[PDB]
Each structure stands twice: as structure tokens, then as C-alpha cells.
């Protein structure tokens with residue numbers, strides 16, 4: 001899992017490759033991403049500011065004239081959402097602009113996060129109805145949130161983890177949910193807040209339904225069960241479920257401030273099942289021994305979801321020690337689902 005989303009960072013041009021039939025543009029590789037650029041705007045090795053997909057860029061026709069026709073209103077401001085595109089057949093994701101367009105970054109170094117100085121914020125799809133409830137309090141500071149870094153941003157890490165084994169799970173398109181025990185308190189959280197129980201709150205309903213609160217009372221340990229709530233009325237319901245349900249993907253050990261490993265998590269899920277508490281888990285694929293490029297990893301992401309008749313969002317890879325994870329989102333999914 002991870003820190004702040006570095007939406008805009010100083011990165012380096014990698015290989016530049018022609019786009020057949022399109023002499024005014026070319027393909028720039030930037031880490032594990034491919035970005036269409038104007039012909040000659042970069043050469044291999046040049047630095048630039050790379051803005052990832054899901055960046056929302058406030059309207060400014062001087063700095064960002066290439067975005068001018070894509071301006072929308074979003075959370076009260078005018079600007080452009082960057083999203084996946086496919087131009088002269090070339091997949092294109094993000095925006096890469098030369099350093100000389102940013103005189104205020106004259107003193108910066110390759111790798112720097114420039115999101116805040118450039119005023120970039122994150123676009124997200126709208127939240128689903130009964131997933132915001134009354135707030136009890138902050139997302140607990142003693143539990144990690146569930147964000148995962150992208151494979152495209154991890155090129156040296158993927159190389160450094162050659163030979164290491166990963167649990168591979170299907171990435172479900174829902175909302176992150178955490179149900180935890182800390183001493184005398186059991187709480188249910190969404191992605192960012194701890195929620196109050198009401199008749200209408202979806203997370204609480206899913207936690208009562210699968211007896212996972214009872215399961216935590218049984219284990220008698222300070223643990224956060226983290227998973228995806230999916231189903232009807234949640235993010236278009238890709239799985240075509242009836243009703244909603246929680247699918248575990250991680251367990252956080254609150255007292256040790258660490259995740260359980262995949263084998264430790266499997267064992268505890270088995271113990272819960274063995275004692276009548278059936279908490280469902282995200283689909284687990286074959287463990288992978290890593291010996292792969294980012295491209296090769298991305299090529300794995302499309303495939304069957306929980307519902308084997310639909311094409312999945314992607315995959316999450318969790319190293320067997322529980323200390324290194326990342327996501328590989330299916331670019332076919334991003335192409336199909338323009339609201340993603």
C-alpha cells in the first residue's frame with residue numbers, strides 16, 4: 001500500500017518511438033507509461049513534468065492550451081480530467097510537458113513531487129449512495145488505509161523484486177471497507193471515515209450480514225479486516241451481484257502496525273470459516289514468481305473477474321512477506337469504462 005498520490009512528478013523521457021502514419025506526434029515512454037507527445041518535444045533523457053491519469057488540471061490556456069477543449073466543471077472549479085486515450089492507435093496516458101514550461105521548478109531534481117506547487121488535484125468517480133453515512137470519527141490513525149501504488153510507477157522496484165513470490169488477487173470495483181477491533185471498541189469504516197450504524201448504511205449491513213464483528217470478538221485480537229464492498233448500486237455493479245457483500249483482501253495487525261502475510265491471512269480466514277463466520281475473500285489466483293517487466297505485468301491484468309463472464313478491473317500483487325504490494329489496472333477496462 002502507499003503514501004500521497006504524486007500526481008505530478010519530474011520524470012525522464014525513456015524510449016521515443018514513432019507512431020506509424022502520424023508524422024506530427026510520437027510515443028514517449030515515461031517509466032511504465034506511454035504518453036503521446038508532439039514530434040521533437042522531447043528526446044530520450046529529457047526531464048519533464050508528468051501528470052498522471054486522474055489528475056485534474058485547472059483551466060489555464062497559457063500553460064495548458066492542449067487541455068482547452070476538455071474543460072469541465074468539477075467540484076466547483078473549471079479544469080480537465082486526464083484519462084486514458086488511444087491516439088492513431090497508440091495508448092496514451094498522462095501529460096508530459098518539458099521543464100522549460102515551469103520556470104518555478106528551476107531548482108528541482110528528477111523525482112520530485114510537484115503536485116502541490118502546481119495545484120494539481122485528484123479526480124474520482126462519484127461515490128455510491130449508502131456508502132456515505134453518518135460519521136463517527138476519523139479513519140483510525142492506528143490502521144493503514146488501503147491505497148496501492150501502480151506498477152507503471154515501480155519500474156526499479158519490480159526489477160529489485162525479481163524472484164520474490166506474490167499473492168495475486170482479482171481487483172474488485174467497489175468501495176474500501178474496514179471493520180476493526182481495538183480493545184473495547186469495534187468499528188466499521190469506509191474509505192476515509194469511521195461510520196455510525198444506521199438501518200441504511202451499506203458497510204454496517206455487510207458487516208452484520210457476514211458476522212465479521214462476531215468473528216473479531218471470537219479472535220479476541222486487535223485486527224482490522226480490510227476488503228471491498230461490491231454489488232448492487234456500487235460503482236455500476238460490474239459483478240452483477242444481487243445485494244451487496246464484503247470481500248476481504250487484507251488484515252492489519254493493529255498492535256504490530258503491520259499487515260498479516262498472505263499465508264497468515266489465509267489461516268485466519270480458514271479459522272473464521274471453521275467457527276461459522278463466513279467472510280468472503282477476493283478471488284485468489286496462482287501465486288506469481290516475479291520475473292517480469294511492467295508491460296508483462298500489465299498484460300496479465302485483463303481477464304475474468306469474480307463473475308467469470310465479466311472483464312476485471314485488474315489485479316493486486318501482494319508479496320508473501322506482506323510488506324510490498326502494487327496494483328496493475330487493466331487498460332482494456334479503462335478503455336471500456338470511460339468513467340474510470
Ligand SMILES: *P(=O)(O)OC[C@H]1O[C@@H](n2cnc3c(N)ncnc32)[C@H](O)[C@@H]1O
Nearest residue numbers: 146147169170171172176228249282316
Ligand atoms: P483501485 O485503483 O481502487 O486501488 C486500490 C483499491 O482497490 C481495492 N481493492 C479491490 N480489490 C482489491 C484486492 N484484490 N486487493 C487489494 N485492494 C483491492 C481497495 O479498495 C484499494 O483501496
